[model samples]
Target: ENQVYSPVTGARLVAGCICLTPDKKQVLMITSSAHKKRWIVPKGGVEKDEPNYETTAQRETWEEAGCIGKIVANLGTVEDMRPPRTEFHFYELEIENLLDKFPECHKRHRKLYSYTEAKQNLIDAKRPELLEALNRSAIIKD
Candidate 1:
């Protein structure tokens, strides 16, 4: 049998946010750098030395989506089904500030999406997992 290599516990952590509208019907998503044709939530790898997952999620949202707000709920985790399987945690953020310019503004375009919009417009290959993650959030209830 071939060897099945995997990361040790506490590694490969990912943190992200599902930014919500004040009315709570839409979510803030962004065009991906890697998948220019698709949209995704603001998220990235968790720094090994960091405050916590929530902070990482908050920070990533500001950097990628250019907004900051309160963390209303923990959306929980989604395990990657592909190689180098990783655990991704997400939070629900209610955006209070959407800047005209912020980090990654030149490369990313932020937009608001309804559940049906996101349902059909994520990175096509990774769509299922992305949908599954959002399914755990409040957005799907609409």
Candidate 2:
């Protein structure tokens, strides 16, 4: 058994999802060409002075995933630690009517794949918590 175990805190990280729509079918999902281009929604690392997901999610969506719309769905939180790095807070983002929002994205990376099209990409490798976040849908209230 291990004794006195505690995680390191204050090390900032940024992670979120971008709403993608490549066709008339179900919306597409945006990922990156970094960190093995992990099959993620949309996200990035946090800056020392700007560690707020509230802002980071929006900025990251644009910078990394080429998202240019409002972030919908705040699907709680998830914890993830990759092979080399450990401890990160993962947030889920949803962007409805995705296409009109991020036109610049199409011009930039030039990599577009629908949810089904990119489902088998190497980056789509299984990550425990990522799945949970993906399945989570937004809760709406009137």
Candidate 3:
């Protein structure tokens, strides 16, 4: 009930994780190479090797942030509303190994952001979809 394999018609499939700290106080957000340090949740388009959206999510997280974890929850999916829309499925993962060096290291950097901080900046940047998923996670504390 929480995952989907097929994307909405005309929207490409994409997916990624929210690496929530074990303490449940923050999540890792990585800098984007495509946008000169623009902060984004690690994500990418579907690839032939991926068996499902979850694999793509894990692959993107590993490549972008050099981290891996157990998925705590499926944060569900959304369609990017801009031109050539993309379908994104997000999962919340428990903090685990963050390798010393992995793919995309030279191109990106990872940082932790509390729920409040991440939401404030990202929503203002017109990326409400990603953070909106975060809001649905167990990560946020009152």
Candidate 4:
């Protein structure tokens, strides 16, 4: 039997948002301003000594997409591709306001596109499956 190792694997805050339009057909996404960041769903590592991932998600929402909404009950967890510490939990985020919600983010990120557009255009090969899973679970509030 071989031993499995993870990089600083204890507990870290990681978050992403799934903002669907009122019609529930479209989704709010961004193209990170960072050089060559690529178009991707907003997410990041939790603060140092953060308590839980949910809080991280809340903060990330504001930072990445300037989104403010209630986190849905249907929480989903997925493992990272890398062994040892290949796991990240995800939540259903409802974008309350599309405009003026994330001003700073808009200034930071260069491009934006619909969920379908993002899936069809952006998304790296290693993480295409992640977007696929997210697309399957995406739900818009009525």
lDDT of 1 by residue, 1-142 (tens): 2112226653377789988888878888888898787888888777756667897899899899899899999988877766446778888888898998998999988898888888777646365666777777777555
Go through the candidates in order and give each one's C-alpha lDDT: 0.80, 0.48, 0.80, 0.58
- TM-scores, all candidates, are 0.87, 0.56, 0.87, 0.68
**Better candidate by lDDT, 2 or 3:** 3
lDDT (Cα, tens digit) per residue for candidate 3, span 28-141: 888768675467788888776667778888888998999989988898987776744677888899978888798898888788989887787576556878877778778865
Candidate 3 residues lying further than 4 Å off, grouped into runs, are 1-8
Q: Which pairs clash (backbone N, Cα, C closer than 3 Å) in model 3? A: none
Better-scoring candidate (TM-score), 2 or 3: 3
Q: What order do candidates take by lDDT, descending?
A: 3, 1, 4, 2
> What's the true lDDT of residue 86 in model 4?
42
lDDT of 4 by residue, 5-116 (tens): 2256743335566655555566656665664456566666765565766777666767777777777644566556553344455676665764455656545553445565
Error of 2 at 136 (Å): 1.3
Q: Which stretches of candidate 1 lie over 4 Å from their true place?
A: 1-11, 123-125, 140-142
